[PDB]
Amino acid sequence: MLVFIDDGSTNIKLQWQESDGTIKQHISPNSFKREWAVSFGDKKVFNYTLNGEQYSFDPISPDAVVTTNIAWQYSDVNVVAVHHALLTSGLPVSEVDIVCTLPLTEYYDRNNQPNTENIERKKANFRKKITLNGGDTFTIKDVKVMPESIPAGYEVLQELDELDSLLIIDLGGTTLDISQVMGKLSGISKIYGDSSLGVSLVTSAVKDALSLARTKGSSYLADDIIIHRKDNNYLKQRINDENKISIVTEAMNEALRKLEQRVLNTLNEFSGYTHVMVIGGGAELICDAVKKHTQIRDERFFKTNNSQYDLVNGMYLIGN
Amino acid sequence: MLVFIDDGSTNIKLQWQESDGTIKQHISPNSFKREWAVSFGDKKVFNYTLNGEQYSFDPISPDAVVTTNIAWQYSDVNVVAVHHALLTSGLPVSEVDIVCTLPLTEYYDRNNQPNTENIERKKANFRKKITLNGGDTFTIKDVKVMPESIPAGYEVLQELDELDSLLIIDLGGTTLDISQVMGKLSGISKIYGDSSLGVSLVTSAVKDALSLARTKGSSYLADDIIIHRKDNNYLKQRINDENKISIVTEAMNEALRKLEQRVLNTLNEFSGYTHVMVIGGGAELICDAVKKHTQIRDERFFKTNNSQYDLVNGMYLIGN
Ligand SMILES: Nc1nc2c(ncn2[C@@H]2O[C@H](COP(=O)(O)OP(=O)(O)O)[C@@H](O)[C@H]2O)c(=O)[nH]1
Ligand SMILES: Nc1nc2c(ncn2[C@@H]2O[C@H](COP(=O)(O)OP(=O)(O)O)[C@@H](O)[C@H]2O)c(=O)[nH]1
Ligand SMILES: [Mg+2]
Ligand SMILES: [Mg+2]
Ligand SMILES: [Mg+2]
Ligand SMILES: [Mg+2]
């Protein structure tokens, strides 16, 4: 079995194909604590051991430690989160080959050439042995690594003439990464990674507006408000009974304005692109400003409506 | 201004393009009551008059009256719902030209030829004069009518050879309609409309499982549960604090099995199609069973991840 894994530091996205020809997409969050969970009843908990440390999936992990999520790519917790995503995907426990991801500035050095040291480091990370209490864990065999961004734009890149170029804008949970690649993948023109802002900027604003606990527990409510920010009818029913709808709508717009200004400022660093694509979980939050501020015809502007999965699907289309 | 309007009896979907080139999509429900709403405070309410009757947008309209929604297409309420959709879209009040829809079996007679009488009736419905209390209403000038289903598959159909044919499966709020069209729109091979089941079957099952009020108010909670039915993490936080996650999950699965069995039974009435497309708000609910049970390669199976808008987007691509 071959599983494509975009192991982001906010959510692990999986994609694979079964025997009946159905193509499956699964998402599991990066939310673990460094201790086992205690269950006195029949609640299922997931308690792991890796490198001699205990970890467990935590549904209310604190939104804390909003720092270096680059180190996370080579961490013990990353190994746990990937195993946890596999364990909760619905696939049967088996040996699996996988293809994982490295952020553009980790996969590539400043010369836009493969950073072999990081690529190997990433593969080695998955050899760390893991155990699950009360169950069998999948076994990771072959590990291939793809860079983020490019796989998402590959289908389009194949169609572009070599002198044309696609600008791929990825807004993730904690970072905003942009790359410009020549048609038919004939070269990387520029990569600009930015780890100062992500969708969590908006999520944090929402949780502050509604004074929600700063944990994973309230992440769902916050995302729903954001996703349905333009539907008063939905907001009317969801918002914690009251009508702080005004104050939340306000906080959202402010964070969104920040994201939009950042992308437009960084966009000015790029030139000569002929096509534009916006991906990642936060794509819908910045697509309008980007389209408005680029001189690119509709026909050459790409955004799907399943953006958080654009990368892993591109990876699957390439390697499956 | 030209607005594309898929005026379905569950939701009105709008699509248009302004000046900056941004393409806008808006959704507004069909939920009105036959009397004005009273507001003693500053809560905005929309009170209309049309054909000599008062109607008002009602956020908690009873889910009742699951009988004939076909007549709704030529009703006074349909005129109000469309004006209400326009009033809440963000567009400025003005004269507008529009293109609306008629269900396949209303647009076409049993010989699969245009039912001019229904087409004219639809156009005339919009000449009914409407008034809003406390504000101005849009003025509808030119009215064009497109049939449902075909516009959604038009992009693909243009690419098909004349001997090939696309099967378009549309699961809406209260109906499931299927059509088979020859490549390059070279003829309609078959239309099978079914008014006995829709997405509301699953919604109703969910409301009964959580004992929610049978009104529009709980529609949002019900749809979220369905949409996130495969995410225990999200369900854990959303379900009315309890743990009927088993019992609601149970009810959904049975309603979904009923929808899947119906589509598959109706599919056996069609043959010779080479490509399949699944659309409508309920597309994600039956796509797997349909893919599983057709002998059509991945490359010839079409499903977007914005299914409730496939038809109006197709309409817009044709006439904008
Ligand atoms: N507003 C919005 N947020 C989304 C959408 N899809 C996913 N997200 C969220 O956007 C954030 C970014 O997730 P993702 O890009 O997958 O990134 P990662 O783990 O850094 O790769 C997450 O918190 C997601 O839950 C969407 O359609 N709209
Ligand atoms: N499960 C699910 N329901 C959806 C989705 N998009 C829309 N819906 C719902 O599906 C139902 C059908 O809506 P729609 O097809 O637009 O039909 P209509 O007004 O009869 O045309 C509505 O209750 C929508 O809220 C989706 O992605 N998933
Ligand atoms: Mg990512
Ligand atoms: Mg990764
Ligand atoms: Mg419809
Ligand atoms: Mg209609």
Curated annotation (Swiss-Prot), chains A, B:
This is Plasmid segregation protein ParM. Pfam families: ParM_N, StbA_N. InterPro entries: ASKHA_NBD_ParM_R1-like, ATPase_NBD, ParM/StbA_N, ParM_C. Involved in the control of plasmid partition. Required for the accurate segregation of the plasmid. Belongs to the plasmid partition ParM family. Keywords: Plasmid, Plasmid partition. GO terms for molecular function: identical protein binding. CDD domains: ASKHA_NBD_ParM_R1-like. The keyword Repressor does not apply. GO terms for biological process: plasmid partitioning. The keyword Repeat does not apply. It comes from Escherichia coli. The gene is parM. Homopolymerizes into double helical protofilaments with a longitudinal repeat similar to filamentous actin.
